[PDB]
Design a protein around this ligand. Sequence first.
Ligand code: AWS
Length: 149
Amino acid sequence: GVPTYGAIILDETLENVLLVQGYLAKSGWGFPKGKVNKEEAPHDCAAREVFEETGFDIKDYICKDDYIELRINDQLARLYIIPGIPKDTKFNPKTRREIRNIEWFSIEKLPCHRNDMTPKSKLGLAPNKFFMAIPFIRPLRDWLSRRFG
Ligand SMILES: Cc1cc(=O)oc2c(CN(C)C)c(O)ccc12
């Protein structure tokens, strides 16, 4: 699979993160990210995708050692961690055809797994509008514990 790069943007308090809402197959909330072009560097893909989806340029903020990276069905996804962005920042997707909304969310109130259906005696997971973000929440919390306390 083709690797994807993007960003976990936090506010000044480290309480809140920035999520984007897609359409159709991407109909819930996730971190801004996308597939890398041929010969494009990780950090440049990250800045490009985040800019298309939020109107915020992260080029001069990226720390090349500061990221979280997961494999998800044999696709690599790396999100660079960008702390200290004020909540009064104007965001503005370029691609209005891809992005329905942008909003800040409380990290402690976000879920880190989806719920089962054992109250109903049925296998699988109940739907969750944070499906795309969920895998990154627990790594993010641990990474923040370590780097800050
Ligand atoms: C929209 C856009 C196109 C592109 O190819 O690269 C970008 C980069 C990366 N460097 C500067 C080339 C940005 O930092 C910010 C925006 C873009």
